[PDB]
Design a protein around this ligand. Structure first.
Ligand code: UTP
Length: 455
């Protein structure tokens, strides 16, 4: 460890608090009970439906809102989805980006109630420049937008265990942002937590930039303030399709990830029958509690190694998760929310869902079509032909109707025309060297289309 510290102190590009923060993760990493796991009670993981909504007194709502900061995690790139820049600036619905919609929602809150709720974006050294030029578009918007850069840590060469920039990899690829658990130290380090405290704010609502369900929820905010919950994680029921779970362990609610489960217990962990809930990454956190625990160096989340191979070299990228911080705060709870609060956009297939007749946009919010029977969204699986946002859009002249869809799987070189209707279970599979065009106004129900012979 003394050699690692010297090496890090040799990296003059690192801030003093980044160096100490990194050595602290490294130290913990280099150092360090299934039968004890319990299901949380309903008082620790509160069903959303038991929470008291705000009264009709608009003044009560304004006073809750005056205490709030909305934060979006914005440290990630549009790379999975074939886009350069930050994921948040992908157009998600009606030509509006994730960031456009977040801004609209907050404007509408401020207009409706007379509050001045700010928006803050946590960027990384990979997204900060693009984001900073983009946010100028909201200069005259009815919301103050703050940005800050999270920590920038050296990738560590796995074998020798030395900082990669110490071996001369000082360009962008030598470094990494150490996960969303870094939100707590970065908020302090950047100065932004102090600015909001000085503005009389008390809580931050943190969410993934690409979660379209993560809207300010007055019922939760009310609960935190009335009941003095310093941390509240939104969890949602676990489905076959899902996730870190909340457990009760040694008297505390804690995040449990598969990484910390013994091999013999991994299959039971994946039972949506044993663990019924999972973390949405919608997190409500008391700002004074954050300052106190960060300054006391008390946030000791599980280390996630996240190994990668970059430019030939195998590296470690020690990180932490924001949800794992729950066990350090006072009177922490989960709240078990309807899945309406969890609509992630991770791939083109999710764009198909949200750009379809399954949703519309109301007042900046992606709003589910009430005509659909199933409360669950249909499963959409698309081949790599559809991976890039541009290519996805090119393969759909319009987004087909899917209100009556159970599932779609598409593979091979497939192109969709306009005004298509899909129902029940649908597969479209173009063989090697075949291009399949689904014609305009096709109605496809409970069908496998395996070639032109099938339509
Ligand atoms: O270091 C980090 C990590 C990630 N994040 C942010 O945490 C949230 C969840 O981070 P994920 O990595 O789980 O979401 P993603 O959608 O970027 O995942 P991929 O499909 O690309 O694998 C996202 O909003 C991301 O931008 C950060 O802000 N900083």
């Amino acid at each position: 460890l003394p050699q690692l510290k010297s090496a890090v102190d040799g990296l003059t590009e690192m801030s003093e608090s980044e160096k100490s923060g990194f050595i602290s993760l490294v130290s913990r990493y280099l150092s360090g009970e299934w039968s004890k796991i319990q299901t949380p009670t309903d008082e620790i993981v509160v069903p959303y439906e038991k929470m008291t909504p705000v009264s009709q007194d608009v003044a009560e709502t304004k006073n809750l809102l005056d205490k709030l900061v909305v934060l979006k995690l914005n440290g990630g790139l549009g790379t999975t989805m074939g886009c350069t820049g930050p994921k948040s600036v992908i157009e998600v619905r009606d030509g509006l980006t994730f960031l456009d919609l977040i801004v609209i929602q907050i404007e509408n809150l401020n207009n409706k109630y007379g509050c001045k709720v700010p928006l803050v974006l946590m960027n990384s050294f990979n997204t900060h420049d693009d984001t900073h030029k983009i946010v100028e578009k909201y200069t005259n918007s009815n919301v103050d937008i703050h940005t800050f850069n999270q920590s920038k840590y050296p990738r560590v060469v796995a074998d020798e265990f030395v900082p990669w920039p110490s071996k001369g990899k000082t360009d962008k690829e030598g470094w990494y942002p150490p996960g969303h658990g870094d939100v707590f130290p970065a908020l302090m380090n950047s100065g932004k937590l102090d600015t909001f405290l000085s503005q009389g704010k008390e809580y931050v609502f943190v969410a993934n930039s690409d979660n379209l369900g993560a809207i300010v929820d007055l019922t939760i905010l009310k609960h935190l303030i009335q009941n003095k919950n310093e941390y509240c994680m939104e969890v949602t029921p676990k489905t076959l399709a899902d996730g870190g779970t909340l457990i009760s362990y040694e008297g505390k609610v804690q995040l449990l990830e598969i990484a910390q489960v013994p091999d013999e217990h991994v299959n039971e962990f994946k039972s949506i029958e044993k663990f019924k809930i999972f973390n949405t990454n919608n997190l409500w956190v008391n700002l004074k509690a954050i300052k106190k625990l960060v300054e006391a160096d008390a946030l000791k989340m599980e280390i996630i190694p996240n190994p990668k191979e970059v430019d030939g070299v195998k590296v470690l990228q020690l990180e932490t998760a924001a949800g794992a911080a729950i066990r350090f705060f006072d009177n922490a709870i989960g709240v078990n929310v309807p899945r309406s609060r969890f609509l992630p956009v991770k791939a083109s297939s999710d764009l198909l869902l949200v750009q379809s007749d399954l949703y519309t946009l109301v007042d900046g919010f992606v709003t589910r079509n009430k005509a659909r029977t199933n409360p669950s969204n249909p499963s959409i699986e698309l081949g790599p032909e559809f991976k890039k946002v541009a290519t996805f859009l090119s393969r759909f002249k319009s987004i087909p109707s899917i209100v009556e869809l159970d599932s779609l799987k598409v593979s091979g070189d497939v192109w969709f025309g306009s005004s298509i209707v899909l129902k029940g279970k649908v597969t479209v599979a173009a063989k090697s060297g075949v291009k399949l065009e689904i014609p305009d106004r096709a109605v496809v129900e409970n069908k496998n289309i395996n070639g032109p012979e099938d339509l």
